[PDB]
Amino acid sequence: MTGQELRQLLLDKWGYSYDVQFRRTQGKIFLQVMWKYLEQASFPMNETEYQEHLDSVANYLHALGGAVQVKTFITQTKERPRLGKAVSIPLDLGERASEWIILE
């Protein structure tokens, strides 16, 4: 996942470039796709800032190995981000992290 792949995943899927933010609960990490998109007039980020935000998110998706989990979740799921329902993507780092732990 790059910031490029991330926006293209949102645009090919739902036809809008949505905001994506990380959330920690119980010690798990989730990528919550907000229902707010840059095509909205009252979006809190400008065009460039929004894209730098996507690429910053995508940097973590690459670092943690949760990028595959996003590209597997969104593509298969029929969920759309709606007012009150965020697409809270479970970033499994079970198999994804244990590679660099080196399981003998």
Side-chain angles (χ1 to χ4, degrees):
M1 184 72 76
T2 58
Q4 177 186 31
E5 296 180 76
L6 188 50
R7 62 173 300 114
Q8 295 293 267
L9 189 58
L10 308 173
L11 290 169
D12 279 289
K13 189 65 183 186
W14 301 309
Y16 294 105
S17 56
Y18 294 90
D19 177 51
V20 291
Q21 289 182 88
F22 291 104
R23 188 181 184 262
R24 294 176 174 168
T25 178
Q26 302 180 330
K28 303 168 176 58
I29 185 62
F30 289 79
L31 185 61
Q32 300 191 329
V33 184
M34 298 288 89
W35 50 92
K36 302 181 176 185
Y37 43 90
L38 185 65
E39 299 83 352
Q40 283 293 331
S42 301
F43 199 67
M45 295 179 293
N46 288 270
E47 300 178 81
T48 310
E49 305 187 298
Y50 164 66
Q51 187 57 32
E52 299 176 278
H53 170 84
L54 296 178
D55 196 67
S56 190
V57 166
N59 184 35
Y60 289 116
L61 296 179
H62 180 247
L64 306 176
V68 184
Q69 306 292 28
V70 179
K71 292 182 63 178
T72 303
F73 189 86
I74 295 185
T75 306
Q76 302 186 95
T77 194
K78 300 177 62 60
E79 292 174 37
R80 289 192 166 224
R82 175 184 174 175
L83 180 61
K85 206 295 175 188
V87 179
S88 186
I89 305 172
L91 304 182
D92 165 78
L93 305 182
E95 59 180 272
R96 304 300 173 172
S98 297
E99 56 174 75
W100 65 268
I101 281 65
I102 298 294
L103 302 182
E104 300 183 64

